[PDB]
Amino acid sequence: ASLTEIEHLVQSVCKSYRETCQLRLEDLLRQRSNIFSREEVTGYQRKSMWEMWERCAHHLTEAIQYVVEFAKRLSGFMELCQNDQIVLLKAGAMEVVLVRMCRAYNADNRTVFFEGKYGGMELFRALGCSELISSIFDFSHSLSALHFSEDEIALYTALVLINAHRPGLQEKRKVEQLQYNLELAFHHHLSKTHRQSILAKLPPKGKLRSLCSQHVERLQIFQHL
Numbered sequence: 001a002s003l004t005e006i007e008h009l010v011q012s013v014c015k016s017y018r019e020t021c022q023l024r025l026e027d028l029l030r031q032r033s034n035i036f037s038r039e040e041v042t043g044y045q046r047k048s049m050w051e052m053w054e055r056c057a058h059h060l061t062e063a064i065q066y067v068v069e070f071a072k073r074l075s076g077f078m079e080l081c082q083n084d085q086i087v088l089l090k091a092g093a094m095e096v097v098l099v100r101m102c103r104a105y106n107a108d109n110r111t112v113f114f115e116g117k118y119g120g121m122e123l124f125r126a127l128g129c130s131e132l133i134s135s136i137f138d139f140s141h142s143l144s145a146l147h148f149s150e151d152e153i154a155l156y157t158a159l160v161l162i163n164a165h166r167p168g169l170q171e172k173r174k175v176e177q178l179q180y181n182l183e184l185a186f187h188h189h190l191s192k193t194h195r196q197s198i199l200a201k202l203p204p205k206g207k208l209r210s211l212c213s214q215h216v217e218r219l220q221i222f223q224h225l
């Protein structure tokens with residue numbers, strides 16, 4: 001790859017990310033003081049497990065659909081075979097959503113933007129799996145310490161998705177090549193902006209995977225990508 005190719009790849013990834021965010025960062029930041037009242041937190045906790053899962057499942061489906069659009073606009077992804085596109089999305093879409101969450105996360109009070117306001121992990125009590133939700137909130141907290149720019153999140157999430165070690169891939173070296181060009185792009189961007197230090201601070205692949213619920217993987221969205 002040339003300097004021109006790598007610079008064009010950086011631009012493509014960052015443009016795709018920009019066009020596939022549901023919410024604008026500036027709006028998310030302005031809304032930080034808009035926190036659910038105790039009455040509203042109560043209302044969420046009052047819902048049945050099913051009622052809460054129906055709401056959350058829909059929001060996650062939408063989030064996943066934005067990740068799919070992100071992938072489609074990523075230079076090189078649509079050139080991979082259909083099997084591999086699907087394998088990568090199945091294994092990585094939720095991981096991308098969990099990274100994207102830090103944009104909607106407020107480290108100051110440990111809240112996430114959800115249905116129009118900020119709320120803590122106690123909003124999600126009716127779902128059960130309290131340890132997992134805590135672990136998810138802890139994960140966003142750790143990511144928040146890095147102070148990612150949007151271009152950084154864009155390049156990092158591209159690499160979360162384009163992982164040549166996902167079991168079930170049928171063009172392994174082709175995915176390896178795209179992954180490598182994305183590695184070049186990410187490392188390039190970080191060197192030029194003097195941000196190489198974040199490489200050592202990024203959570204490992206295994207960490208992201210452990211945060212993905214079985215219940216998410218069973219959502220019908222994964223049969224209709």
Ligand SMILES: C[C@H](CCC(=O)NCc1ccc(OCCN2CCOCC2)cc1)[C@H]1CC[C@H]2[C@@H]3CC=C4C[C@@H](OS(=O)(=O)O)CC[C@]4(C)[C@H]3CC[C@]12C
Pocket residue numbers: 020021022023024049050053056059060063066097100101103104112113114124127128129132133136212213215216
């Ligand atoms: C953390 C939360 C829970 C996830 C989870 O997995 N919890 C474990 C669990 C527990 C029980 C369960 O259910 C059992 C009940 N059973 C199941 C079997 O059937 C019977 C009932 C299922 C799962 C999720 C839910 C919604 C997620 C938001 C959805 C959308 C966005 C927008 C996006 O903006 S953008 O600009 O970037 O695009 C940024 C991200 C953000 C903020 C998301 C952030 C994350 C959130 C809060």
